[PDB]
């Protein structure tokens, strides 16, 4: 009986579902597990709710990953639940941004006359405490440090955009073994809430290609969050200008860590692929 | 703008598109390849169109792999399909079988009281001829013969039920590293139209466990024309009864090659998972 709209950005693609009724989520994590099987249910890398709003704010996003668990942010998320809003409002809608609350803190979105969504992603969060992570104190950076995973020493900078990000920097980020790394990044001890994972092979100054191993969802075809904090750790260690583009599987991201506010602005598409309901 | 039902039979999971109003599928191949694409589409092993009847039969099936290409049958689709057609036909049904024509020939579903849909999938071809491949002269079954892949030479029999299967018998069908061997066997130059590669392990004389690379759709959780291959190869070559379970990834079959008439029967579930428009 339940009714939602299929979206992706940039093939990181989700179950919508207008949640607008009630605060209460219209289905359990464990039930968003089975709806984001891709053989027995829908299929996907999470749900997304569109919400009603708190403290002032339009609206409320929750996610559930398709493990179930629920992250704090999600930036193709925002992206393709600021298109379902639009939809949803109609000839109602008054305004081309959104104040949208989340677990991270209030996230703002903007649909532009092209088509795309540039959004608000708030400040970084650089502090050991913030991630959080063991590799440094609390109150330290976590910037090319060591972290061994099965031997190998990696290194690593941590992150936060809402959601806890480790990013290294590699030559060849197509011959990186995901499949098999991956989830010994995300389970690593040194990440007690677990940790998103960012392969990162620089480009140029401008141009970063990013492959990503997900808490919760494994291998997906881009992540917005991910890419924000990529670039925020391509600038923390020197390599990369404050405004770049992150290649992903499913395609670009355009980043911008702004000298203005000091903010993480993130550009993107959203596409609609089918309305549904589940029998 | 086109409306689909999601079904899986044993997480095989397909698209079924009502195209009773044309003998002329509604969706091109290349269109059914973007609809199975499983983060930027609708996801799906493949598409299957419920079609007019030709010849006396009830309805006509044919089904599009993932990849675009067209074979000949389809077991876990042609339960799907039962299913569809009674849920299209609803109370005016005034039977428990369909005859469906295919390419493979005329195939008939019942639908059984507890559910399961038992199907009549027709007389199992042994012939290298009907395979097709090139391992035996075309008038020679194929039992228990070499083929050599990357240089290590299997043991394998092959057996068309429509479209063609190559078996081989394994110790642990686990141990299988099935993404990196399973399209060498698709591809061999032994079979000029491709090939489904079936693993199985033989528990006892009427329990086989078994994987598959798909010819077209690579692993999959069940396949019924490939279950019902394999139980023919496995009684090809003594290795079990005529009546046996198949354990698919995705659950169980079960498999009678009749001595009344010497048929193969494929007895499964078929779910409705949920309905769908395209934007
Ligand atoms: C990929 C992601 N959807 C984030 C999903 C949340 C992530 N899997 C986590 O668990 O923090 C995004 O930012 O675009
Ligand atoms: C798996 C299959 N759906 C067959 C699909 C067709 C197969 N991929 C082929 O190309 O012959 C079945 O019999 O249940």
């Given at each position: 009986?339940?009714?939602?709209?299929?979206?992706?950005?940039?093939?990181?693609?989700?179950?919508?579902?207008?949640?607008?009724?009630?605060?209460?989520?219209?289905?359990?994590?464990?039930?968003?597990?089975?709806?984001?099987?891709?053989?027995?249910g829908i299929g996907a890398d999470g749900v997304?709710?569109?919400?009603?709003?708190?403290?002032?704010?339009?609206?409320?996003?929750?996610?559930?990953?398709?493990?179930?668990?629920?992250?704090?942010?999600?930036?193709?998320?925002?992206?393709?639940?600021?298109?379902?809003?639009?939809?949803?409002?109609?000839?109602?809608?008054?305004?081309?941004?959104?104040?949208?609350?989340?677990?991270?803190?209030?996230?703002?979105?903007?649909?532009?006359?092209?088509?795309?969504?540039?959004?608000?992603?708030?400040?970084?969060?650089?502090?050991?405490?913030?991630?959080?992570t063991n590799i440094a104190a609390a109150d330290?950076?976590?910037?090319?440090?060591?972290?061994?995973?099965?031997?190998?020493?990696?290194?690593?900078?941590?992150?936060?955009?809402?959601?806890?990000?480790?990013?290294?920097?590699?030559?060849?980020?197509?011959?990186?073994?995901?499949?098999?790394?991956?989830?010994?990044?995300?389970?690593?001890?040194?990440?007690?809430?677990?940790?998103?994972?960012?392969?990162?092979?620089?480009?140029?100054?401008?141009?970063?290609?990013?492959?990503?191993?997900?808490?919760?969802?494994?291998?997906?075809?881009?992540?917005?969050?991910?890419?924000?904090?990529?670039?925020?750790?391509?600038?923390?260690?020197?390599?990369?200008?404050?405004?770049?583009?992150?290649?992903?599987?499913?395609?670009?991201?355009?980043?911008?860590?702004?000298?203005?506010?000091?903010?993480?602005?993130?550009?993107?598409?959203?596409?609609?692929?089918?309305?549904?309901?589940?029998?």
């Amino acid at each position: 009986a339940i009714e939602f709209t299929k979206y992706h950005g940039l093939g990181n693609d989700f179950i919508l579902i207008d949640n607008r009724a009630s605060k209460t989520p219209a289905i359990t994590p464990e039930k968003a597990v089975e709806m984001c099987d891709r053989h027995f249910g829908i299929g996907a890398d999470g749900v997304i709710f569109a919400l009603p709003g708190e403290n002032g704010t339009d609206y409320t996003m929750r996610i559930f990953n398709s493990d179930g668990s629920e992250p704090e942010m999600c930036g193709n998320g925002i992206r393709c639940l600021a298109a379902f809003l639009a939809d949803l409002e109609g000839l109602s809608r008054n305004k081309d941004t959104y104040r949208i609350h989340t677990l991270a803190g209030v996230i703002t979105p903007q649909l532009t006359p092209d088509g795309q969504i540039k959004v608000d992603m708030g400040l970084p969060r650089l502090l050991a405490g913030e991630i959080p992570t063991n590799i440094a104190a609390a109150d330290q950076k976590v910037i090319n440090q060591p972290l061994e995973v099965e031997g190998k020493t990696w290194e690593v900078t941590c992150v936060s955009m809402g959601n806890p990000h480790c990013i290294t920097f590699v030559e060849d980020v197509a011959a990186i073994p995901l499949e098999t790394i991956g989830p010994k990044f995300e389970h690593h001890p040194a990440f007690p809430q677990r940790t998103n994972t960012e392969f990162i092979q620089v480009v140029s100054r401008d141009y970063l290609k990013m492959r990503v191993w997900e808490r919760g969802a494994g291998i997906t075809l881009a992540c917005g969050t991910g890419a924000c904090a990529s670039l925020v750790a391509a600038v923390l260690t020197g390599r990369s200008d404050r405004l770049a583009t992150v290649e992903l599987p499913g395609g670009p991201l355009e980043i911008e860590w702004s000298e203005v506010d000091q903010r993480i602005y993130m550009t993107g598409p959203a596409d609609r692929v089918f309305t549904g309901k589940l029998h």
